[PDB]
Amino acid sequence: GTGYDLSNSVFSPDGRNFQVEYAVKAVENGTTSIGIKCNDGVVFAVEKLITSKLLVPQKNVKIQVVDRHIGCVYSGLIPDGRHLVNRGREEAASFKKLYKTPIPIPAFADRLGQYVQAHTLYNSVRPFGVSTIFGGVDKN
Amino acid sequence: TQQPIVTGTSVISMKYDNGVIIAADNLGSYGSLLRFNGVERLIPVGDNTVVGISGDISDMQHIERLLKDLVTENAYDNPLADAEEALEPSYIFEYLATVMYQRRSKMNPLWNAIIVAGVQSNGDQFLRYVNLLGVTYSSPTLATGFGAHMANPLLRKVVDRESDIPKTTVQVAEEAIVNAMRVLYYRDARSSRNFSLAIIDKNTGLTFKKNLQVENMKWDFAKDIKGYGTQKI
């Protein structure tokens, strides 16, 4: 039948999760942002649309830092992005508190990964409406 | 409720015309055993504040971790973190005081005595104390433990009241502090000869001196002392 797209964790007959696919649409509708890996670091850049002359220039920062060595930028629903970074920060603090060393990028990546995946498991929550580009430098 | 195990003795400080000075030796005692010698008890926060801690060393290390986090946290979504919105000495103190008082109120204190030294953004000198009970106070000179009994009297001969601050130079102040550290080394059984000293100047910034040593000690007169009353040789 139909209606497979009305609830978040439902598998459609072809094995898809339509709500996650709709979340992607919100992302594609967002500003463009990128990341470039160089020989010893990474660079992040984002497009900030000027809705009007009234926006104070250089004041509505979109790129965010996690711990002291990680950068995160995203496209889509900005509030969802912030929510994800808040979690990322708690995740980083937790790792440093227990292991002392600042969190490795791959480790941090999975932390965000597991959390985002978690929001595709229940119909009581909605998927994140953002795609996130992040990274930094670590032990290796 | 607990009991201190590895401990740090005195932390002394005073303010002069352009800033503040704070010092503390590098010892970590275990009862009467002078167990550790490479212990730094002066914690720099940014470039305008230094936190000197005495008491339980395990709790000191915890406070250290708390401070590094305050810095990280303050930098989040803060484009002015190294300017107008950088951590002020007064913000750091209020935070620690708050923590100290909450911990004693839950009958589980951080067994320490802390002195926060720094220069505010408007140039004002900042010097305030807080301990395991949550008790706080300010004075031209501040010292914890033994230094409260032997350092304040010497440091107060230099700055006895507020009006003496502007008349006091970095040289005079540092000289007074260094002499006090020597006196403490003479009469405090839990002190060390090596210590650190930090200066927070509203002009020269933060100067952190490591591996200082008590020098110019008088011991020669000891050769003439014999017996405990009637012995002649």
Range of the domain at B216: 1-233
- Taking each helix axis from N to C end, the angle separating B146-155 and B170-187, rounded to the nearest 10 degrees, works out to 140
Q: Which 3-state string (H, E, C) describes A90-129?
A: HHHHHHHHHHCCCCCHHHHHHHHHHHHHHCCCCCCCCCCC
Q: Which amino acid is at B142?
A: L
What is residue B202's DSSP assignment?
Answer: T
Non-local CB neighbours of B43 within 8 Å, separated by 6+ positions = B50, B51, B52, B53, B63, B64, B67
What's the CATH code of the domain at B189?
3.60.20.10
Q: d(Cα A118, Cα A84) in Å, to the nearest integer? A: 12
Backbone angles phi, psi at A25, to 5 degrees: -65, -35
Number of domains in chain B: 1
Best residue of A58, A63, A65, A99 to probe chain B, by most B CBs closer than 10 Å:
A65
Q: Is the Cα torsion angle B30, B34, B37, B39 positive or negative in sign?
A: positive
Q: Which helix (H) or strand (E) holds B177?
A: helix B170-187
Residues in B closer than 8 angstroms to A61, CB to CB, are 77, 79
**Other C-beta atoms lying within 10 Å of the C-beta of residue A9:** 15
Name the residue among A59, A65, A97 with its Cβ closest to that of B76: A65
Residues in B closer than 8 angstroms to A56, CB to CB, are none
Query: Rounded to the nearest 5 degrees, what angle is found at the Cα of A70, between the Cα atoms of A66 and A74?
Result: 80
If you measure CA to CA, which chain B residue comes closest to A68?
Answer: B72
Burial level of A6, CB count in 10 A (0-12/13-18/19+)? Answer: exposed
Q: d(Cα B53, Cα B76) in Å, to the nearest integer? A: 27
The experimental method behind these coordinates is X-ray
Contact A65 B69 (CB under 8 A): no
